[PDB]
Structures are given as structure tokens and as C-alpha cells.
Amino acid sequence: MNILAIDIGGTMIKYGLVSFDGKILSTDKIKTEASKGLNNILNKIDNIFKRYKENNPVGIAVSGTGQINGMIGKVIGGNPIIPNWIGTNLVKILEEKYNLPIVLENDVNCVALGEKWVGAGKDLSNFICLTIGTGIGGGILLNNQLFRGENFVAGEFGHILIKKGEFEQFASTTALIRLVKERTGKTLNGKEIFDLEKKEILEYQEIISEWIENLTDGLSSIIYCFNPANIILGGGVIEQGEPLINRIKNSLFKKIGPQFKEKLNITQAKLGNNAGMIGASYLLLEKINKR
Amino acid sequence: MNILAIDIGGTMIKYGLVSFDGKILSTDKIKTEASKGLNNILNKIDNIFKRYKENNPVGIAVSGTGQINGMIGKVIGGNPIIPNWIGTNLVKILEEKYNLPIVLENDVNCVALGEKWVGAGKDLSNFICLTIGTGIGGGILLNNQLFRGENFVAGEFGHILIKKGEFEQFASTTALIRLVKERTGKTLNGKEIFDLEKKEILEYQEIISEWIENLTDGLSSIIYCFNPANIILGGGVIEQGEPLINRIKNSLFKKIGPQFKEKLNITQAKLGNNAGMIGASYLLLEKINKR
């Protein structure tokens, strides 16, 4: 007894089976080919279903890209990276085709729910969980429930303002890569950039330190709004910490007042790139039972 | 019966009786004299209680200054304007002294609950309420409940960043006055500032327009965090009413995406400077009413 989980990212689709206890049982990967459009993605989903059809999945749980109404499983907006993706009720399409319960939820909410279930939030009822990849987004857990916003787009932290501009444009991993490119002429990986800092090359120390300041600028605005006790950081370059987590703490605590930091902890996501599949599966199980 | 409501500001204390339906029955004012300290505050509360003892109030509901844990009624921080105020467990002290139920809550949470009870939040289960006076603060209502934060200081919106610096420093009424003072040498009250704009004085039109942009910068960050459907603005120059609200709305809608503005209302608080007394009383009634 397992769940067929599908994590549709802008570049990769990761899929496999998740147990009723939130354990990854198997995983695979396939290129999204986002520019080929919705019917491309539905074809890939169909091949995923045949590959697992005889595992008798109780349903299909999908983590998607873009702005999504997760109550009904509809893409309502976001960046137009996949033609005809926006507007799609994937719960509609897949429930009719495969005659199984479906959920569709946006990317960072699934990660947050994954960490809530079996990850860095498993002992928490409240936290803010941010992923730092190509952009910055957040999933908000308040009194044990995901907080989606009145129009399902709460937690789009990447668009808040910091001193330099949009949060995302200066504190995502993409922004870090861009800062290195602007100053050194080199187009590097997040790992490659931090390896160079590990060799104490001054140029990369100054850029990463500047990027950390951009990052804790935006975090402090979030903390003044929410006064959380727990922030969970994930994605990409968070692969780096605990040493990264500590620098982020030190930088942040200089920018927020005593009542905002005295009970505040910042910790690393535990589930890595599986959080999305796990969180989507958590949502599917809520939908199936109770009720 | 009735509720004895006390609104402690940094300069004045406003107090009187509030009905069980949220109606102001009487008000008085007396100087806070903040520098005289906690024992001074307790004396004023005592004289306030003696004046109304013979109406047999069901309890004392206090809107306080500073950072406050409203669940237990203790001052936990803020700017140290009243010696020994911070650390004071006012509910413990007053329930023992007067043997009536007491509540103590921070300023903008009381305003929010006031607007929730009988003001602009009368029919809403979710909203964000900002006061725009000497600083900027907010009370957050989510699923019919005040959202205080894990350490009781959620909603300190004045400290989030905008491109120019701290929100409060460029978008409070104090900031507007300071902007007029820096550009013209004159110290005006805000009515005087907007009166000069109605006279199409170019200098004051340009300053107010710049101040409005500062304000919607900060609001846009709040909207990206919370994706509310209802924002209630009160305090200071919001006295100007609908002509100002509409300009704020137009300025703001240029800065947030369709899913954030499609269902969003900017509305004016209805209760003015009586909201605090009314909301503190709402809180006391919540404490009193159980089976």
C-alpha cells in the first residue's frame, strides 16, 4: 500500500512510490521538456503510471510548478514556462483518465508539507519553510495547517523588497550564480562557487558574504511579519550548511530585535529533493481519509 | 452590564465604559506621564477604577503600549518609555488588586479586534489591519483569530525593508511630516500638509506622492507574504478618507501581480481612535464567556 507521487519541476520530473508512512520506496527521473507543453507532461505522466500501474497505487499525488489552487488542483498563474499549463485542472484530467484520487499542489507547499510530515518539521506545529533555488518561495505552517493565502499565493517571498530590489533577484541561488558571473566572468555551479570559498579565495568570500546579507535582509522582513519560532531552509546551496546555516543565523540576528530572535531557530530541510513527493503524498492521504 | 476599558498611549491614557455590544458609553483622558514609571501607571488605573467602581464593571480591559504577551497580559519589551513597565504581569497584579477579570493586549492588536467586532472587520474572518501614525503596526486576523506570533510580536510591519530603508521611517505619518520638514523647513501636522496639497501647491503634491509610493512599497511586501483579501488602514493621515485610500490602492496595484490584487480590498478603519478600547473589551468578553 503506497502512493504514486510525481514532482513536476521546471527542468526535471521526479517520481516514484511513497509509503503511507512517508517513506520513499523508489524514485526515477525524466526530463520535463517544459517548452513542449501540457500534453507532453500528460504523456510523461501516463508513462509514469504504466510503469507503476501494477503496484496498485491508492492515487496520484502531484507537486507542480506555477501558482496553484491546491484545494481543487488547478494551475491559476505563475510564469508561463509550460504552454497550456496555466488553467489546467490536473485533478480533473487525471481522475477521469485513471479513476483514482488525485491532488495537485504547488512546489513549495509540497516541500513544506513533506518536512512537516517526516522531515525537519516533524516535531513542529508552526514554521516557515523556504526553498532557495532558481527563485525563493515559502510554505507557511500555522496551527498544524498549511496557510495558502486568500488566493492561494501566500508565501511568494521572492517578490518582497530588500534594499537592492526584489528578494529573489539578489538571494536565490540563481542570483548567487549571477553575482559570481558579473564579478568574475565565470559561470559556475552553486557547489563550485562554495568549493572556491572553501579554498579561501578572497573574491568568492566577498560575493558569498554579500549574498548572505541579501538573504537575511529578506528573511528579516518575513520575521517582522510572522514572528515565527522556526524557519526551515532548503534547496540547492543549503546542501552547504550546517556551516551555512550558522552564517545565516549570525547575519540575521544582527538585523532583528530581541523578541524576534530570542526563541527563533533556523534549521535545514531534511528530505532534500524528495520533500515535494512526500508532501504531495501527505496531501493525497488527507484527501482520502479522514473525511 | 459594562466593561471598563483603558487605552494606555505614550502621551495620553483614554478610558471609559464600553457596552457588551461594543458601544462607547463614556470616555475621559488623562496624561500618561510615562517617565514617572509603573507605580504612576498603577495609580492612574486606580483612580480610573475608583471613578467607575459604582457602575460595577464586569472587568478591566487594557490596551497597552510596548510589546505585550496578550495571552497572559504581560509586558515583554518595546521601547523603554515607562520605567519598570517591561516585565510587568499586569493581569496578575490587577486581578489580585481588584478581584475582577483583566486583560492586557498590545495597541494594534486591540485596534484590529475593535475593527473586527463592530468596525471595518465586522464581517471578515481574515484581514490585515495597519495603523499609520507615529510608526506603522499591524494586527493580523486569520480564521477569525488574532495571530500574535510565536513570541507575541507578529505584525511589527514598521521594521520591514523597502528600497529606501525601514518602512516606518518613510511611510508613517511621522515620516511624512519629516519629509515636509526636510524639504520646506516647516513643521506641519498632516491636515496642514494635505490642505496644502488641495491648494495644488506643487511642493506638497510631490512630497505626498513620494510618501504614497513608500507606503505601497511596504504594503506590497506584506501582500506577497500573506496574500490577504482585505487590508484595513487606519491612523494619522488616513483621516483623509476615500480620496487617499483610492490613490493608495492604485499605487499598490501597480506593484503586485494579478493573483494578489484580483480579490484584494483596501478599506478604511471605521472606529478611529476608539478601536483600542473596543478591541480590548472584545478580548475581555472572550475571556469571560465559557461554559
Task: Please report residues of B whose CB lies closer than 8 A to that of A264.
Answer: 151
Rg (CA), chain B: 19
**Distances from the Cα of B290 to the Cα of B206, B284, B285, B286, B287, angstroms:** 54, 12, 10, 8, 8
Distance in angstroms (rounded) separating the CA atoms of residues A222 and B212: 22
The cell for B214 is 513608500
Question: What DSSP designation does A134 have?
Answer: S
Distance between A286 CA and the closest CA of chain B, angstroms: 20
Of B148, B152, B221, the CB nearest to A161: B221
Distance in angstroms (rounded) separating the CA atoms of residues B84 and B38: 6
Interface test with A, best of B75, B124, B153 (most A CBs within 10 A): B153
Distance in angstroms (rounded) separating the CA atoms of residues B274 and A123: 42
The cell for A200 is 579561501
Task: Please report residues of A whose CB lies closer than 8 A to that of B136.
Answer: none
Query: Do strands A24-31 and A74-77 pair parallel, antiparallel, or not at all (unpaired)?
Result: unpaired
Distance in angstroms (rounded) separating the CA atoms of residues B56 and A50: 75
The cell for B82 is 515607562
Query: Do strands A161-162 and A165-166 pair parallel, antiparallel, or not at all (unpaired)?
Result: antiparallel
Distance between A70 CA and the closest CA of chain B, angstroms: 14
Q: Which amino acid does the sequence have at B119?
A: G
Yes or no: say if A128 and A228 are a contact pair by the CB < 8 Å rule.
yes
Resolution of the experimentally solved model in angstroms: 2.2
Cis peptide before A290 (omega within 30 of 0): yes
Q: Tell me whether residues B221 and A224 touch, CB distance under 8 A.
A: no
Give the side-chain half-sphere CA count within 13 A for A211: 26
B159-188 burial string, b = 16+ CB within 10 Å, else e? bbbbebebbbbbbbbbbbbebbeeeeeeeb
CATH class entry, domain B1-105: alpha beta
Yes or no: say if B55 and B37 are a contact pair by the CB < 8 Å rule.
no
Strand order in the sheet with A145-146: A145-146, A136-142, A127-132, A230-234, A265-268
What is the full DSSP assignment across A110-131?
Answer: HHHHHHHHHSTTTT-S-EEEEE
Yes or no: say if A91 and A287 are a contact pair by the CB < 8 Å rule.
no
Helix B38-52 to helix B90-98 angle, to the nearest 10 degrees? 40
Residue with cell 579565495: A201
CATH 3.30.420.40 fits B106-291, yes or no: yes
**Distances from the Cα of B267 to the Cα of A36, A53, A216, B249, angstroms:** 44, 53, 32, 9
The cell for A167 is 528578494
Distance in angstroms (rounded) separating the CA atoms of residues A194 and A247: 13
Distance in angstroms (rounded) separating the CA atoms of residues A95 and A251: 47
Q: Tell me whether residues A225 and B229 touch, CB distance under 8 A.
A: no
Closest by alpha carbon to A90, among A72, A106, A113, A114?
A: A72
Distance in angstroms (rounded) separating the CA atoms of residues A160 and B160: 10
Per DSSP, the three-state class of A249 is helix
By residue count, chain B amounts to: 291
Method by which the model was determined: X-ray
Distance in angstroms (rounded) separating the CA atoms of residues B235 and B91: 28
Distance in angstroms (rounded) separating the CA atoms of residues B269 and B155: 17
Cis peptide before A242 (omega within 30 of 0): yes
Yes or no: say if A22 and A69 are a contact pair by the CB < 8 Å rule.
no
Yes or no: say if B220 and B256 are a contact pair by the CB < 8 Å rule.
yes
Of B154, B160, B258, the CB nearest to A77: B258
Question: What DSSP designation does A93 have?
Answer: H
What is the full DSSP assignment across A141-192?
Answer: EETTEE---TTS-TT-GGGSEETTEEHHHHHSHHHHHHHHHHHHS----HHH
Closest by alpha carbon to B171, among B238, B121, B112?
A: B238
Q: Tell me whether residues A226 and B154 touch, CB distance under 8 A.
A: yes
Q: Tell me whether residues B160 and A225 touch, CB distance under 8 A.
A: yes
Task: Please report residues of B whose CB lies closer than 8 A to that of A223.
Answer: none
Yes or no: say if B10 and B275 are a contact pair by the CB < 8 Å rule.
no
**Distances from the Cα of A35 to the Cα of A11, A65, A76, A82, B238, angstroms:** 10, 13, 18, 5, 48
Distance in angstroms (rounded) separating the CA atoms of residues A277 and A110: 7
Residue with cell 530541510: A269
Closest by alpha carbon to B163, among B128, B237, B203, B215?
A: B215
Closest by alpha carbon to B62, among B43, B45, B50, B78?
A: B45
Name B245's Cβ contacts closer than 8 Å, sequence gap at least 6.
B233, B238, B266, B267, B268
**Distances from the Cα of A148 to the Cα of A108, A211, B100, angstroms:** 11, 28, 40
Chain-centroid distance of CA B176 in Å reads 18
Distance in angstroms (rounded) separating the CA atoms of residues B63 and B44: 14
Interface test with B, best of A227, A230, A263, A264 (most B CBs within 10 A): A227
Residue boundaries of the structural domains of chain B: 1-105, 106-291
- Give the residue on A whose Cα is nearest the Cα of B69: A259
Three-state SS string over chain B comes to CEEEEEEECCCEEEEEEEECCCCECCCEEEECCHHHCHHHHHHHHHHHHHHHHHHCCCCEEEEECCEEECCCCEEEECCCCCCCCCCCEHHHHHHHHHCCCEEEEEHHHHHHHHHHHHCCCCCCCCEEEEEECCCEEEEEEECCEEECCCCCCCCCHHHCEECCEEHHHHHCHHHHHHHHHHHHCCCCCCHHHHHHHHCCCHHHHHHHHHHHHHHHHHHHHHHHHHCCCEEEEECHHHHHCHHHHHHHHHHHHCCCCHHHHCCCEEEECCCHHHHHHHHHHHHHHHHHCCC
Q: Tell me whether residues B157 and A217 touch, CB distance under 8 A.
A: no
Closest by alpha carbon to A105, among A256, A275, A290, A264?
A: A275
Q: Which amino acid does the sequence have at A260?
A: F
Residue with cell 457588551: B20
Dihedral pair phi/psi, residue B22, rounded to 5°: 85, 20
**Distances from the Cα of B266 to the Cα of A140, B130, B138, B234, B247, angstroms:** 24, 11, 14, 11, 10
The cell for B72 is 497572559
